[PDB]
């Protein structure tokens, strides 16, 4: 029932994401020089370095907030892709499946810890 445990769990999950090849297009903000129309389609850019930095600065209050930002990386990829068969979008789907598979217990444990605290 550790209310703070999600933070290190998210740091470890981000380490796994950064280790894998599929995260390369999502590690840093999208290069606007290589994709000049990006901000015409995407309102809120997001990347894994920004998520990790927000976490490390103590600027997430819960794993749900981190999860909303990570999901924004994947929804931005889906919205910017010219095709559902594109290389970068296909990497985003694999990374999203891995992220969802691992964030589920982090969210459940956190919500369980808060319920126990409220008793
Ligand atoms: C992650 O942003 C993208 C998502 C998709 Br889908 C296609 C291209 C980009 C730009 C980039 O390759 O950084
Ligand atoms: C850290 O990422 C992974 C680790 C393992 Br094991 C399997 C799949 C992935 C996701 C991906 O490579 O897209």
* 45 Cα: distance to centroid of ligand 2 (angstroms): 23
Count of domains for the chain: 1
Nearest bound ligand to CA 91?
2
* 94 Cα: distance to centroid of ligand 2 (angstroms): 7
Nearest to 76 by CA among 36, 109, 27, 41: 41
**30: Cβ below 6 Å to ligand 1?**
yes
For 5, counting Cβ atoms within 10 Å of its Cβ (0-12 exposed, 13-18 middle, 19+ buried), the class is middle
Which residue segment(s) compose the domain that 84 sits in? 1-119
- Where residue 86 sits, what CATH number does that domain have? 1.20.920.10
* 30 Cα: distance to centroid of ligand 1 (angstroms): 6
| Method used to determine the 3D structure | X-ray
Given a contact cutoff of 8 angstroms between Cβ atoms, the answer to whether 107 and 5 are in contact is: no
Given a contact cutoff of 8 angstroms between Cβ atoms, the answer to whether 27 and 48 are in contact is: yes
One-letter-per-residue 3-state SS of 24-61:
HHHCCCCCCCCCCCHHHHCCCCCCHHHHHHHHHCCCCC
**99: Cβ below 6 Å to ligand 1?**
no
Instruction: Give the DSSP H or E segment for 84.
Output: none
Q: 63: how many CB neighbours lie within 10 A of its CB?
A: 23
């Amino acid at each position: 029932y550790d209310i703070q445990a999600w933070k290190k769990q998210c740091e470890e999950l981000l380490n796994l994401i950064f280790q894998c090849e599929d995260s390369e297009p999502f590690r840093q903000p999208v290069d606007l020089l290589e994709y000049p129309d990006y901000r015409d389609i995407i309102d809120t850019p997001m990347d894994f370095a920004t998520v990790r930095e927000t976490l490390e600065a103590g600027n997430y209050e819960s794993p749900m907030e981190l999860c909303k930002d990570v999901r924004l990386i994947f929804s931005n990829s889906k919205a910017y892709t010219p095709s559902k068969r594109s290389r970068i979008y296909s990497m985003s789907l694999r990374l999203s499946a891995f992220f969802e598979e691992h964030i589920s217990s982090v969210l459940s444990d956190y919500k369980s810890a808060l319920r126990f605290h409220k008793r």
